[PDB]
Design a protein around this ligand. Structure first.
Ligand SMILES: Cc1cc2nc3c(=O)[nH]c(=O)nc-3n(C[C@H](O)[C@H](O)[C@H](O)COP(=O)(O)OP(=O)(O)OC[C@H]3O[C@@H](n4cnc5c(N)ncnc54)[C@H](O)[C@@H]3O)c2cc1C
Ligand SMILES: Cc1cc2nc3c(=O)[nH]c(=O)nc-3n(C[C@H](O)[C@H](O)[C@H](O)COP(=O)(O)OP(=O)(O)OC[C@H]3O[C@@H](n4cnc5c(N)ncnc54)[C@H](O)[C@@H]3O)c2cc1C
Ligand SMILES: C=CCc1ccc(O)c(OC)c1
Ligand SMILES: C=CCc1ccc(O)c(OC)c1
Lengths: 524, 524
C-alpha cells in the first residue's frame, strides 16, 4: 500500500479518516483503479517514479482549508491539480512520489462570473477551455477564450504552470487577474483588488496595493488556488488564418529574422506566430510507419515524401489576422511581401486549402480564434505507445540562435534514436524552441533514452544561455539547478519563502525544484 | 540629533563608521542641510513626521550588500530611493521616521545596455527619464521611453512603485523585465532568465522558471533593486494628439461609457486616455488668484470664466494616435463620430491649437510620444506653497461609477477647503480617479485638513468598492488596512514573507503597511 514519504501507516490512516469527515467517503479515493488513473501517461525513466497515495476532492475553498489543516496535523504532503492534463510534464502525478493529490477541479468546476462588457471571467479550477468556450457561446458570445492546443485543460491549471495559447491573449498569466488561494497552513487569501472587501474591480487590474504576489503562485507549491480571474478578449469582426510553407531547412534563419520585426509591435503579426517543422505537421495527419518502417533516424527522402505528399515545407508558418476585411487584406499584403522574399515560400489562407496538408492550418484557425480542439492529440498516433516530454528553452528571436538550436537538438535526437519534431514560437521579444520528443512509453529502453536525451538537451541549451521555461517532474531539480546565478541565489530565495509559508512542508514538495526543509537534500 | 528607532546612540555611531568604511565618508551624509534635502517637499501631517537620520550612497551592488549586512549587525532600518522624486507619496522621506536612506541613484546611475533591435534597456536606479530619452535619441533613436508627467523621476524607482505613463507601454511594471535585487540580509539574486548564468534573454521575457517573484519587489520592502530591465517601444512612423472639450460636468457619465469600448481593444484609443477637469487644466497655465481672491470654494461663475477664457470644457479629453497618416485619420474619424454624439463636444489636434488653452494638449503630445517634460510642475504654482498628496482609487470604467466618485470626492474637497482638480484615466479595463489635492505646505491647518480629507476619501472610496492603488507614507497603514479580506490575510501573508527574508527587520519598515516583527504594533 503506497504511503507518503515520512508518514507512518498510523498517521496516514488517521489523516484519511479526517479527510473523509471533511469531503465525504466518495471523495477520498485510495482504490488501485483510481490511483492508476493519476499515473503520468508519458513517464520518462521509471514508469513507477511518481505515484499517488490517495486523491482528495474538496467541495469548496472551506474544505480545501480543512484538508490542508489536516495534512499539517499529520505531515501529509499534498500535490495539486485542477484538471490534471499536464501531459508532457507529469500529467496528474505528484513530483514527490507517495503524495496525496488534491483534485480541485472535480467539484470546484463552476464559472462563477462572466462580465461581457468589461471582458472577464471568475473561474474555479475545474473549468476546462471547452467549458468556458461553451459558456461564452451560450451567454457572452462577443467574447472568446485563449486556449492551448488541447481544450481539455484547465483555464486555471494551465495559467498556474504559465502555459500559453496563440491569440493576442496568449500569455495566460498576464491576463490572469485576481486569485483566491489557500496558503500552506490553511489560511485563505485574495490577491489584488479582491483583498478589499466588497471591491468591484478584482478582475479589472491584476495589482492591488503593496507587493504583487500572484506570480509567486505560478510554477509554485506556495498554495492551492480556489478561484482565478481572467480577462477575455472581444471577438474581432473577422479573422483569417494563413500557412506559409518554406522548402529548405536552412530557411529557418531568414524566417525568424523576418518574423521578429513583424511581431514585436504586435502587427502585422497580430497573434502568436508558430513555425512548425515537417514532422510536427505530418504527425497530425499520418503515422511514422507510412513514411519509414526501418531502424534509425528518418531518412531525408522520407522527409521529402512527407513534404511532397502533404504539400508542406520543411518549416510551416501559421498566423492569424483580425479585424475588418480591409485591415486583414492590408496586413496579409505586408506579410506576403516580407516572407515572399524567401525563395520557395508558398502562401495559403484557411479559405484556400482543405486537403490533408491543411489539417493543421484549419486547427490553428480554430485555436487562434479561441475555438478549443483535441485534433493535436492525433500527434500521439505517430508511433505505438507514443508519449511526449516537454523541452522548450527560451532564446533571442534571432535566426542565428534558431539555426544553432535546430542543429544542436536534432543532432542529439538522431544520436538518442528520437525524431526531431519541433516548432519555433515568438511570443513578443522571446523565442521558444518547443521540441515534441516522442517515445514509446511501453519500452523501458525508449523511456530511459528519452530522459537521458532531455537531460543532455537541457544542459547543452543552458551552456549556450538558453533556459528551460517549463519542465517535467523528473527534470525539475536539474532545470532549477541551471538557474544558479550567484551560487544558487534564486533557489535559496524560494526555499526561504517556502519554509516561511509552509513550516510543516506540506504543499507539492519539490515543484520547480523547491523542497521544504523536511524533504530537501533527500534525492526524494 | 535624529536617531533611528530601536538603535542606541552607540550602535548608530558604530554603524555610521561601518557605512563610511565601505562607501567612503563623502557618501555618508548626516549634516542638517543634506538631511533637509530628503524632507518630503509636500508634507501632510506634521512637517517633521518622516525624517532621515543619515543618507548612504553605495557605489555598486557589492556595496549595497555590505551596507545591508552592516544594517543587520546594528539593527539600522534602511529606507530606499532611486532618484527620490516620489512627490505626492513622501518624496525621498522614509516611512519609518529616523531611518537611514539608501540613495541607490547617486552612484548607480548607468544605462548598462540598450538593444535597439529587440527593444530593451538594462538600467541602474539613477537613470532618469530625461537620461534614457537623451541616450535613445543619441544611440537608439527608433525607440522611445514611457514617462510619467515629470521626467526627473527614475525609470527604475517609478516602476518599483508601480507608477505609470501614457504611451501603449504605460504600465511600467508590465514592461519591467528582469531585475537584480539585494535581499534584506545582504544576499543578491537575479530574477527571471537572468538567474541562468550567461543568458541572452534577461530582458526578453519577465518569467524564468519556478515562482515569478518580481512583483514582490514593487511597492515593497523585500529588497534593494540594483539593476532593472525594461522593454522599449518602437516609435511609430507618425503620431497625432487631440483634445476633446466637453462643456458640462454631467457629460462625465457618457464620456466614460463611450471611452471604455474604444479603449478595451487598445484601438482606436491607442494610448492611455486621460480626462482632466477644468481646474487641472487651468492650473497649468494660470494661478487660482487670477480667477478668484475671495474665500471658500471657487464659485461656479469662476469655473465658467476659466472655461470661456481658456476655450476649455469642464472635462478635457487628451489622446494620441500612432501609425501611418491613413490609420491616424481613420481612427480619429471613429473617435470624432463616437464622442461627437455628446452635445457641445469640440475637437482640436496638436497641429490646430497653440493658444494658452492648448498648453496641456502640447505637453500631452510630448509625454504620449515618450518626450519627457517638467511642464506639469506649473500646477504647483496654483496657490502659494502648493503641495499635493496622491489619491487615485481604482473603479470600473463605467459612467455611473465615474459620476458617483466625481460627486463624492468634490463634495468632501469643498468641505475640507481644497479645490477639486482631478482626472479620470482608463488603463485598459480599469479606471483611476486621480485627484490632485493641492494644499499650502506652510500652513499647519492646511496640512492637517489635507491628511484628514484624504483619510476620509480613502474610507468612503473603500466602502464603495474602490481601493487605492498607491499612497503616501502617512496613509500606508490605513490603505493596507482597507485590503483586509479574510481578517487581514493579505497583510499576514506579507508579514510572514517579510519576517522570513528580513529577520532583523531592516528594509523600509512599514512600506505598504508591512512592518517587520520588531516594529509592528508600535504606532511606529
Ligand atoms: C500534444 C501536446 C500539446 C500541448 N500544447 C500545449 C500548448 O499549446 N500550450 C500549453 O501551455 N501547454 C501545452 N501542452 C502542455 C499541457 O498538456 C497543457 O499545458 C495543459 O493544459 C496543462 O494541464 P491542465 O490544464 O490540466 O493543468 P493541471 O495539470 O491541472 O495543472 C498544471 C499544474 O498547475 C499546478 N496547479 C494546478 N491546479 C492548481 C491549483 N488549484 N492550485 C495550485 N497549483 C495548481 C500544478 O503544479 C499542476 O501540475 C501540450 C501537451 C501536449 C501533450
Ligand atoms: C504633479 C505630479 C504629477 C505626477 N505624475 C505622475 C504620473 O504621471 N505617473 C506616475 O507614476 N507618478 C506621477 N507622479 C508621482 C511621482 O512623483 C512619480 O511617480 C515619480 O516618478 C516617482 O519618484 P521616482 O521616480 O523618483 O522614484 P523613487 O522616489 O526613487 O522611488 C519610488 C519608491 O520605489 C521604491 N524604491 C525606489 N528605488 C528602489 C530600489 N532601488 N530598490 C527598492 N525599492 C526602491 C521605494 O518605495 C521608493 O519610495 C506625479 C506627482 C506629481 C506631484
Ligand atoms: C505541440 C506542442 C505545443 C506545446 C506548446 C507549449 C508547451 O509547453 C508544450 O509542452 C508540451 C507543447
Ligand atoms: C497630475 C497628476 C498625475 C498623476 C498620475 C499618477 C499618480 O500616481 C499621481 O500621483 C501623485 C499623479
Amino acid at each position: 500500500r503506497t504511503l507518503p514519504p515520512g508518514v507512518s501507516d498510523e498517521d496516514f490512516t488517521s489523516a484519511l479518516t479526517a479527510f473523509r469527515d471533511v469531503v465525504g467517503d466518495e471523495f477520498v479515493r485510495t482504490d488501485e483503479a483510481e490511483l492508476a488513473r493519476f499515473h503520468d501517461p508519458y513517464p520518462v525513466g521509471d514508469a513507477d517514479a511518481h505515484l499517488a497515495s490517495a486523491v482528495i476532492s474538496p467541495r469548496d475553498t472551506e474544505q480545501v482549508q480543512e484538508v490542508v489543516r489536516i495534512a499539517n496535523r499529520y505531515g501529509i504532503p499534498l500535490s495539486v491539480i485542477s484538471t490534471g492534463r499536464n501531459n508532457g510534464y507529469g500529467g496528474s502525478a505528484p513530483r514527490l512520489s507517495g503524495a496525496v493529490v488534491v483534485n480541485t477541479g472535480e467539484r470546484m468546476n463552476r464559472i462563477l462570473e462572466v462580465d461581457e462588457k468589461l471582458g472577464y471571467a471568475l473561474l474555479e479550477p475545474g473549468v476546462t477551455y471547452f467549458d468556458l468556450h461553451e459558456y461564452l457561446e451560450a451567454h457572452a458570445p462577443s467574447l472568446m477564450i485563449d486556449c492551448p492546443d488541447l481544450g481539455w485543460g484547465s483555464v486555471v491549471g494551465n495559467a498556474l504552470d504559465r502555459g500559453a495559447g496563440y491569440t493576442p491573449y496568449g500569455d495566460h498569466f498576464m491576463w490572469q487577474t485576481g486569485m483566491e488561494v489557500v496558503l500552506p497552513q490553511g489560511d485563505v487569501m485574495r490577491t489584488g483588488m479582491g483583498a478589499l472587501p466588497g471591491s468591484t474591480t478584482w478582475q479589472l487590474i491584476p495589482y492591488g496595493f503593496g507587493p504583487y504576489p500572484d506570480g509567486m503562485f505560478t510554477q509554485s507549491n506556495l498554495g492551492i488556488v480556489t478561484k482565478m480571474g481572467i480577462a477575455l478578449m472581444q471577438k474581432p469582426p473577422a479573422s483569417m488564418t494563413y500557412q506559409i510553407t518554406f522548402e529548405n531547412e536552412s530557411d529557418l534563419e531568414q524566417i525568424v529574422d523576418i518574423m521578429l520585426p513583424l511581431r514585436i509591435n504586435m502587427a502585422p503579426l497580430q497573434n502568436v506566430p508558430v513555425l512548425r517543422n515537417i514532422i510536427l505537421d505530418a504527425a497530425v495527419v499520418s503515422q511514422r510507419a507510412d513514411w519509414y518502417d526501418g531502424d534509425g533516424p528518418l531518412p531525408p527522402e522520407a522527409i521529402e515524401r512527407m513534404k511532397k505528399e502533404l504539400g508542406l515545407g520543411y518549416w510551416n508558418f501559421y498566423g492569424t489576422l483580425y479585424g475588418p476585411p480591409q485591415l486583414i487584406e492590408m496586413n496579409y499584403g505586408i506579410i506576403k511581401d516580407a516572407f515572399g522574399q524567401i525563395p520557395g515560400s508558398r502562401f495559403q489562407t484557411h479559405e484556400e486549402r482543405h486537403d490533408r496538408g491543411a489539417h493543421v492550418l484549419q486547427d490553428r484557425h480554430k485555436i487562434n480564434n479561441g475555438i478549443p480542439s483535441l485534433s493535436e492529440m492525433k500527434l500521439m498516433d505517430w508511433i505505438p505507445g507514443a508519449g511526449h516530454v516537454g523541452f522548450s528553452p527560451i532564446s533571442p528571436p534571432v535566426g542565428r540562435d534558431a539555426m544553432k538550436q535546430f542543429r544542436m537538438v536534432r543532432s542529439r535526437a538522431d544520436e538518442y534514436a528520437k525524431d526531431y519534431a519541433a516548432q519555433f514560437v515568438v511570443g513578443l521579444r522571446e523565442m521558444h524552441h518547443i521540441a515534441l520528443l516522442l517515445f514509446d512509453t511501453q519500452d523501458a529502453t525508449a523511456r530511459n533514452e528519452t530522459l537521458a536525451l532531455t537531460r543532455l538537451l537541457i544542459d547543452e541549451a543552458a551552456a549556450e544561455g538558453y533556459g528551460e521555461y517549463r519542465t517535467h517532474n523528473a527534470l525539475m531539480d536539474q532545470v532549477m539547478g541551471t538557474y544558479n546565478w550567484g551560487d544558487g541565489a534564486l533557489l535559496k530565495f524560494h526555499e526561504a519563502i517556502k519554509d516561511a509559508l509552509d513550516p510543516n512542508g506540506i504543499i507539492a514538495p519539490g515543484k520547480s525544484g523547491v523542497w521544504p526543509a523536511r524533504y530537501r537534500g533527500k534525492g526524494l
